[PDB]
A paper describes a structure:
The TREX-2 complex integrates mRNA nuclear export into the gene expression pathway and is based on a Sac3 scaffold to which Thp1, Sem1, Sus1, and Cdc31 bind. TREX-2 also binds the mRNA nuclear export factor, Mex67:Mtr2, through the Sac3 N-terminal region (Sac3N). Whereas protein transport is generally facilitated by karyopherin-β family proteins, mRNA export in yeast is mediated primarily by the Mex67:Mtr2 complex or in metazoans by NXF1:NXT1 (Segref et al., 1997; Braun et al., 2001). Mex67 is a modular protein containing four domains: RNA-recognition motif (RRM), leucine-rich repeat (LRR), nuclear transport factor 2-like (NTF2L), and ubiquitin-associated (UBA).
Diffraction quality crystals were obtained with ctSac31−20 and ctSac320−40. The complex with ctSac31−20 crystallized with P21 symmetry and the structure was determined to 1.8 Å resolution with Sac3 residues 15–20 (QVNNPF) clearly visible in the electron density, whereas the complex with ctSac320−40 crystallized with P212121 symmetry and the structure was determined to 1.85 Å with Sac3 residues 30–37 (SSVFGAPA) built into the model. Both crystal structures also contained the ctMex67 NTF2-like domain together with ctMtr2 and were refined to an Rfree of 19.3% and 20.3%, respectively, with excellent geometry. The Sac3N motifs bind primarily to the Mex67 NTF2L domain, and crystal structures of complexes between Mex67NTF2L:Mtr2 and Sac3N peptides identify a central role of the motif's Phe residue binding into a hydrophobic pocket on Mex67NTF2L. (2001) to which a PGFGQ peptide derived from nucleoporin NUP214 bound to NXF1, albeit with the chain direction reversed. This cavity was formed principally by Gly500, Leu501, Leu530, and Gly531, and accommodated a single Phe residue from either peptide (Phe20 and Phe33) with neighboring residues forming several direct and water-mediated hydrogen bonds. A conserved intrapeptide water-mediated H bond was seen in both Sac3N peptides, linking the Phe carbonyl to the carbonyls of Asn18 and Ser31, and the Sac3N20−40 peptide also contained a water-mediated H bond between the carbonyls of Gly34 and Ser31. Additional contacts were formed between Sac3N20−40 and the NTF2L domain, as the Phe residue bound was not at the C terminus of the peptide, with putative main-chain H bonds between Glu379Mex67 and Ala35Sac3, and a water-mediated H bond linking Asp377Mex67 and Ala37Sac3. Although the overall fold of the ctMex67 NTF2L domain or ctMtr2 was not altered by the binding of either ctSac3 peptide, a translation of the loop region of ∼3.0 Å prior to helix α1 of the NTF2L domain (residues 376–382, the pre-α1 loop) was observed for both peptides. However, in the ctSac3 peptides in the present study, a greater contribution was made by residues neighboring the bound Phe; as a result, this residue only contributed to 39% (ctSac31−20) and 35% (ctSac320−40) of the buried surface area.
Author numbering:
A (entry chain B): 3 to 72, 76 to 164, 168 to 183
B (entry chain C): 30 to 37
C (entry chain A): 364 to 417, 422 to 436, 447 to 556
């Protein structure tokens, strides 16, 4: 199980990207509770390049979809689209405690499906220049494989995802 | 605690 | 045409003890030639394993396995061997053919400490994108697989054969080109 937690993160994350919206808010860097507790910045690797901040990743996504001249895509073609084919999630620490309010420790035991550190793998395709619902009229097609380490967003769980779990580590590959 | 050693 | 993100080689940032190297050199050699020996070395009662999909020898294999007691199959330590037995025979390229491998790894905080002596332990995340030759002798099926495999490694339980163990092993079998 725990797919349900991963599903909500996955749906949020690739939707932001596909709507040209930022994903930086999903990383630990931008959660005050985690950072004042001393959490390090997210460890992000993009096709083998270590990327220092989530903000820089958003900028890179923007650059990837940028069109410069001489040629131009017909209207109605979308510069970049990510299609998720599959995702899978394992719990790698069911007793995650870092930056937890003590109350959350007390309220949810490791068997209770809340205080979960998760390893998430996502695979699918990247379409360049395709019509938004086409998988055939692309100019270029890549395979992509994303992996994440997700940690509990105490701020939200105290009170689906895109905010229920935060990204602590992220590796992106496309080829 | 770590068994992997420090990153370089 | 918009331009895809630049593609760089493997980004290997493991700790000084070079466990990612020792582990992966053993892993793919044994996966090809002595697969089940991996489990007592690195797998324990808590390890979890998944195989996912993104004719295919593996497809028919995981189908029949799942019926019995794009598609997903998740198992605990009790079934890992039995599943691995059913997965296709393989030959992977040597790891020193560096351009045939995309291996990214880093150490990360806040695993549990199985000794209970500390509140946290460092982990090692290893993600692999590679290819191999796959064969199924009976069905005369031979071809080239493209795959992803993500490992999470962490400190082993007291008494284990190595000081580290596999916590999580996620195999994604996408493309299969017959040949």
């Amino acid at each position: 199980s725990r797919r349900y937690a991963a599903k909500s993160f996955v749906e949020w994350y690739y939707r932001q990207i596909n709507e040209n919206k930022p994903v930086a808010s999903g990383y630990v860097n931008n959660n005050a509770t985690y950072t004042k507790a001393g959490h390090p910045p997210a460890d992000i690797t993009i096709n083998g390049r270590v990327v220092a901040t989530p903000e820089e990743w958003d900028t890179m996504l923007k650059e990837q979809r940028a069109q410069h001249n001489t040629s131009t895509l017909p209207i109605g073609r979308k510069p970049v689209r990510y299609d998720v084919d599959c995702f899978d999630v394992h719990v790698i620490n069911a007793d995650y405690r870092f930056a937890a309010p003590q109350r959350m420790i007390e309220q949810h035991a490791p068997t209770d499906g809340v205080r979960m550190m998760m390893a998430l793998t996502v695979s699918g395709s990247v379409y360049f220049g395709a019509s938004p619902r086409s998988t055939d009229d692309y100019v270029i097609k890549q395979h992509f494989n994303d992996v994440f380490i997700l940690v509990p967003n105490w701020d939200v769980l105290e009170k689906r995802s895109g905010r229920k779990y935060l990204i602590a580590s992220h590796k992106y590959r496309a080829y | 605690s770590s068994v992997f050693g420090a990153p370089a | 045409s918009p331009t895809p993100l630049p593609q760089l080689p493997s980004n290997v940032r493991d700790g000084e003890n070079n466990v990612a190297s020792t582990f992966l050199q053993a892993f793919f050699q044994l996966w090809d030639h002595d697969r089940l020996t991996l489990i007592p070395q690195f797998y324990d009662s808590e390890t979890t394993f998944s195989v996912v999909f993104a004719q295919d020898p593996a497809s028919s294999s995981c189908s029949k396995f799942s019926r019995n007691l794009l598609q997903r199959l998740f198992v605990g330590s009790n079934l890992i061997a039995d599943l691995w037995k059913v997965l296709p025979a393989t030959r992977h390229p040597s790891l020193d053919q560096t351009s045939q491998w995309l291996i990214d790894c880093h150490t990360f905080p806040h695993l549990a400490d199985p000794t209970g002596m500390a509140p946290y332990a460092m982990g090692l995340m290893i993600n692999v994108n590679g290819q191999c030759e796959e064969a199924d002798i009976s069905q005369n099926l031979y071809g080239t697989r493209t795959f992803s495999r993500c490992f999470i490694l962490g400190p082993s339980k007291p008494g284990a054969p190595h000081p580290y163990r596999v916590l999580s092993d996620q195999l994604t079998l996408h493309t299969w080109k017959p040949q």
